[PDB]
Structure formats: C-alpha cells, structure tokens
Enzyme design. Structure first.
Site, PDB file in Angstrom:
ATOM      1  N   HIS A 155       5.514   8.434   2.991  1.00  0.00           N
ATOM      2  CA  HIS A 155       4.268   8.832   2.270  1.00  0.00           C
ATOM      3  C   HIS A 155       3.754  10.236   2.667  1.00  0.00           C
ATOM      4  CE1 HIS A 155       2.153   6.489   5.612  1.00  0.00           C
ATOM      5  NE2 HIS A 155       1.332   7.547   5.519  1.00  0.00           N
ATOM      6  N   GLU A 211      10.234   3.192   4.499  1.00  0.00           N
ATOM      7  CA  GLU A 211       9.054   4.055   4.813  1.00  0.00           C
ATOM      8  C   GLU A 211       9.413   5.073   5.904  1.00  0.00           C
ATOM      9  OE1 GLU A 211       6.762   4.238   2.761  1.00  0.00           O
ATOM     10  OE2 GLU A 211       5.464   5.692   3.811  1.00  0.00           O
ATOM     11  N   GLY A 226      -5.236   8.293  10.552  1.00  0.00           N
ATOM     12  CA  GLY A 226      -4.860   9.481  11.344  1.00  0.00           C
ATOM     13  C   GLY A 226      -3.786   9.147  12.368  1.00  0.00           C
ATOM     14  N   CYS A 255      -0.824   7.607  11.397  1.00  0.00           N
ATOM     15  CA  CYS A 255       0.449   7.675  10.630  1.00  0.00           C
ATOM     16  C   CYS A 255       1.421   8.637  11.321  1.00  0.00           C
ATOM     17  CB  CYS A 255       0.220   8.132   9.193  1.00  0.00           C
ATOM     18  SG  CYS A 255      -0.555   6.885   8.133  1.00  0.00           S
TER      19      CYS A 255
END
Ligand SMILES: Cn1ccnc1-c1noc(C2CCC2)n1
Length: 182
Positions: A41, A72, A146, A148
């Site tokens: 992402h 992911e 924050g 990630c």
C-alpha cells in the site's frame, strides 16, 4: 530493557531506513545488498525518498502467493551507493506462531520506538482495507497509525512487517527466507 529489545535495537540501527512515497512515510527494512521490503500500500514508483534523498527504484515486485492472493509485501531494489548488512539468516523458513515479539518503528515523527506486542498468532486470511490477504500475523495493538513498515522481531528472528490494525489488534505480513533466495 531486555534481550527482546536488544535484538530489535540491533535490527533497527543497521537495517532500517525512512522511505517516503506519495502515500506517506514508512519504516523500510533492508534485507541484503540494495534489497528492502515495504508494505504494498506504499505504492512504490520509479523514484522513492530514502532518508530524504531522491533514489531511483531499480526494481519493485508486489508479492502474491500461488493462489494469486495479495501478501502485502513489496520487494524493492534501490539505486543506493551502500549495501545493507545481510540479515537473511534471521528470517523464518516456515509460517509459525511466536511468543514475546517486539514491533520497532523508525520515522521523522516516531523516532526509535519499540513496542512489546507479546504473543503473535499465525492468523492467515485477513480482509485488509478491502483486499483479501494471506500469511497475516496478528497481535494486540490498541492504538493508531504511522507504524506501517514497522519491523516485528522475536529474540533471534525477523518475522514480519506491520501492515495495519483495527484499533484493538495489529497485523503484520510474514517475512519468509524463500522470498529473498538469489
Ligand atoms: C503513540 N504511538 C505512535 C506510534 N505507536 C504508538 C503507540 N502508542 O501506544 C502503542 C501501543 C498500545 C500499547 C503500546 N503504540
């Protein structure tokens, strides 16, 4: 404070950079040579900022399993003048559950942050922001964002990168040795 935080600190100090895309700031884990991981992402493009320096992306691959399901993880090769310490021998070979894990986060907002998240479940399938995702690790994480790209370690293993949460639990994408065989 203890050998959990010791292992985590050693990975953060040598194997993390701050990555900035158009989608914001990420903790990015360097694995070997010029090869790093970031959550998919982040939407890595042709150029990325690494510790605030304009860097050409030589290659970027969004991993999927053999059922063609999102994992992911994006593997990035950076046009950087310096190699990472090789940490491939700290990657697990198989999907597993874990005790006593630490999430470590390095950003321009959240410098040197270490969270003892504790027990980690092999959760497997998660609908993550609407995207069917496999090989998800689940832990207790009652907070916000924050994180990630934050790195999940046990004593002696680097086991995943933080990809999301629901305000009560947090979710990490598994790192496996076979992702980085060359
Ligand atoms: C404030 N902040 C920024 C990034 N991460 C956090 C954070 N806060 O609390 C926590 C967990 C909940 C128990 C420890 N993480």
């Amino acid at each position: 404070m203890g050998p959990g935080f010791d292992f985590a600190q050693a990975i953060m100090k040598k194997n993390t950079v701050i990555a900035r895309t158009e989608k914001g700031e990420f903790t990015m884990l360097g694995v070997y040579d010029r090869v790093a991981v970031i959550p998919t992402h982040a939407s890595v493009g042709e150029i990325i900022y690494i510790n605030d320096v304009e860097t050409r992306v030589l290659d970027a691959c969004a991993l999927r399993d053999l059922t063609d399901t999102n994992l992911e993880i994006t593997i990035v090769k950076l046009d950087r003048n310096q190699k990472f310490r090789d940490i491939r021998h700290f990657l697990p070979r198989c999907e597993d559950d874990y005790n006593d894990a630490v999430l470590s986060v390095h950003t321009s907002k959240f410098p040197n942050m270490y969270i003892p998240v504790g027990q980690v479940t092999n959760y497997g399938f998660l609908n993550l922001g609407g995207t069917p995702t496999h090989r998800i690790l689940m832990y207790n994480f009652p907070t916000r964002a924050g994180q990630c790209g934050g790195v999940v370690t046990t004593t002696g293993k680097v086991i995943g990168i933080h990809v999301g949460g629901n305000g009560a639990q947090g979710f990490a994408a598994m790192l496996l040795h076979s992702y980085f065989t060359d």
